[PDB]
Design a protein around this ligand. Structure first.
Ligand SMILES: Cc1ncc(COP(=O)(O)O)c(CN)c1O
Ligand SMILES: Cc1ncc(COP(=O)(O)O)c(CN)c1O
Lengths: 333, 335
């Protein structure tokens, strides 16, 4: 009964009914602009819906390349996924062993167990530094940068130290847009690196699932052989193309989210909370289990959702009134 | 002495995109565009605030509408899930079981995906009469059986499938072409825990570019499947397309009726010409041809900007519009 083994081995699947003020999945506070939804639909060919539509199409790759804005990338350095999740998932199917460093993205462990990958979890140090680990060729090492859930940034030397082991580094730059530095340039020097990106956070397209990966031609070829061939829909691609053609609105939204993040980080410091230097669309607050659970319960009654972790809570940046409500809840507590 | 990227390149087939000829009859696609009225309905129902969230996949409404379409008394929400195409459902099932079993001539992606993900698999060819062969299978195996079969379009008897179910092996019944045949083996789930039926919106609803498949099975299996698959695997808008299609099935019913009549008309004409064909019940016909005579037909078709699908024993020709079908028959008549 293989299905019993999956009950034992893999984590259960659950749908959770969202609270009124939901600040728990690092989603953008803003709806996708209505004008751009309109543009999407006046670009749609109903005759195109009936066919197996190339994933990615050429135009989406040209626009992603234009967004990346390098001198050295070509179309063979870029592919797409059904979310960044798919890219991670597929990478776990590709290598002998997956390595990651708690506190990290919760789906690494989940997907490893889901697909029965060999994996090694070694915790980040007390200072949130990457630990000493025995890794090499055959391994893929998943490093989110900025880190999730801490939002902190690993120094370049840290990433490079792993790169010099020969292990394959999967640099998950899901929160790149809120930080503004990318290690994509390291592809000039290292063949053993892939940078993973998404439209979900900064472009308000989490429901449409478009991720992309930037890597060497050898890797991208291999990835494209292992993934599903028609993995991103015609309309998801069109949403991503239209978003890339109108970046100014998204830049203004990002600017608001970062200013709102830093304002919250300052207020929390002034209150005496121990926080991380987060560079994502969220803040991380350290708290003790007992302080945490009392706060959580209070938020529960006020119809607010944040994300609980072992060492504290991760609060996504929302709208000005939501952010102020959070600060007020933390002040009393 | 080989880095993992070289191993993949060795074992897995290359990624290759196709160039579409002016008359393309090679991927079992619906001839008709998705209705314009329904595209506008999707745009109308679309909530731009929903676009920014990790949207449930499947949402509750999509499930309700799939159940209503299936129209049984005994299925609940716990018996149904979704995939990013039926392709994803197959792919995940291959990750779920110890061994994958299929029977050539069969769906080309089974072998491809097995090799892609490094699944252990067993390929045993169908008999001369297109019957499922004697095979040593049991618990731990998943046996992929398309019904109607792809590329032959022929229908397996219930007894053939029930024999496999009784082994204890898990049967994945791929009902991608159900709509063009009209009988389903979903009622077997009253009795067998041991079974999943896979379905798609791609062929009958002209939504191949939006990738919505669904699977119907026991609660135990669906739970397991939902643990192994990507949690947000089908997009908000893909789900809205599928929901709107299910709210307006009469147009799709008339299209399916046209496709089946068109298929049977072609099957008759080909028999009258002296071609050996299968009794196809999909949106396509399968014509047996000797290798060398088949290649000659292909050059003619290539010369005339027509794509069909070439197989070891013949060609699988998807039903298109009346004018493309008529043209196929001319070229098979003159040939
Ligand atoms: C670190 C990290 N990586 C990947 C993802 C996935 O994003 P996507 O919506 O594009 O699958 C997320 C968000 N769940 C993330 O936080
Ligand atoms: C037998 C079979 N099964 C599954 C599929 C997949 O359908 P989908 O387009 O929804 O991935 C196809 C079509 N590619 C098929 O022919």
């Amino acid at each position: 009964n293989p299905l019993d083994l999956i009950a034992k081995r893999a984590y259960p699947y659950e749908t959770e009914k969202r609270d009124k003020t939901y600040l728990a999945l690092n989603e953008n506070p803003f709806p996708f602009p209505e004008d751009l939804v309109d543009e999407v639909f006046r670009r749609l060919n109903s005759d195109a819906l009936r066919i197996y539509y190339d994933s990615p199409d050429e135009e989406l790759i040209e626009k992603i390349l234009s967004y990346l804005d390098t001198d050295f990338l070509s179309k063979n350095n870029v592919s797409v996924g059904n979310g960044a999740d798919e890219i991670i998932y597929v990478m776990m199917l590709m290598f002998d062993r997956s390595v990651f460093f708690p506190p990290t993205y919760s789906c690494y462990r989940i997907f490893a167990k889901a697909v029965g990958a060999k994996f090694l979890e070694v915790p980040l140090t007390k200072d949130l530094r990457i630990p000493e680990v025995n890794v090499g060729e055959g391994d893929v090492v998943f490093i989110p940068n900025p880190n999730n859930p801490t939002g902190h940034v690993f120094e370049r030397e840290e990433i490079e130290r792993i790169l010099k082991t020969g292990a394959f580094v999967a640099l998950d730059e899901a929160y790149y847009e809120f930080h503004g530095e990318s290690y994509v340039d390291f592809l000039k020097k290292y063949e053993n690196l892939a940078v993973i990106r998404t439209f979900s956070k900064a472009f308000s397209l989490a429901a449409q699932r478009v991720g992309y990966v930037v890597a060497s031609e050898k890797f991208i070829d291999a990835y494209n052989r292992v993934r599903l061939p028609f993995n991103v829909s015609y309309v998801s691609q069109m949403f991503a193309k239209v978003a890339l053609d109108h970046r100014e609105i998204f830049e203004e939204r990002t600017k608001f989210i970062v200013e709102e993040r830093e304002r919250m980080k300052s207020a929390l410091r002034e209150m005496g909370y121990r926080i991380t230097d987060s560079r994502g669309n969220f803040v991380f607050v350290f708290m003790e289990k007992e302080e945490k659970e009392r706060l959580l319960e209070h938020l529960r009654t006020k119809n607010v959702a944040v994300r609980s972790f072992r060492e504290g809570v991760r609060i996504t940046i929302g709208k000005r009134e939501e952010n102020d409500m959070i600060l007020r809840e933390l002040e009393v507590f």
